[PDB]
Amino acid sequence: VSYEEFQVLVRRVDRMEHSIGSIVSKIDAVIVKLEIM
Amino acid sequence: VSYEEFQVLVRRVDRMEHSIGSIVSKIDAVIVKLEIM
Amino acid sequence: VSYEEFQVLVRRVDRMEHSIGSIVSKIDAVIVKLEIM
């Protein structure tokens, strides 16, 4: 396994961590809307 | 690091991207339900 | 690509699967709250 292909995956995982953070932010916002509804 | 083990991880990341897409679809649906409630 | 660096990524993916499971649990809980509201 070469460095280039491995970095492709590292870049994707980092991207997904960002996607997960955004999803967590959205779900937590929804949770607050329901708690105060 | 061999190709076989690396592909196991590549397959898992691809699977997780699908899981993330589904989660995003669900959260966006919930967001719309709250906006029109 | 060495074993050490590859394991760093394997550990992170495993962590993210846990993060995804928690997000799925939260979104499913929200979905039920809306269905019974």
Quote the crossing angle between the two packed helices B3-35 and A3-35, to the nearest 10°.
20
Q: Which residue range(s) make up the domain with B26?
A: 1-37
Nearest Cα residue to B19 out of C30, C12, A19: A19
List of chain C residues whose C-beta atoms are within 8 Å of the C-beta of residue A30: 30
Helix (H, G, I), strand (E, B) or coil at C25: helix
Distance CA C13, CA A23 (A): 17
**Experimental method for this entry?**
X-ray
Give the number of domains in chain C. 1
How far is C32 from C10, CA to CA, in rounded Å? Answer: 33
Say which of A13, A20, A30 has its CB closest to residue B34: A30
Which of C13, C16, C27 is the closest to B26 by Cβ? Answer: C27
Q: What is the resolution of this structure in A?
A: 1.9
Alpha-carbon distances of C30 from A9, A16, A33, B11, B29, rounded to whole Å: 32, 23, 10, 30, 11
DSSP symbol at B36? T
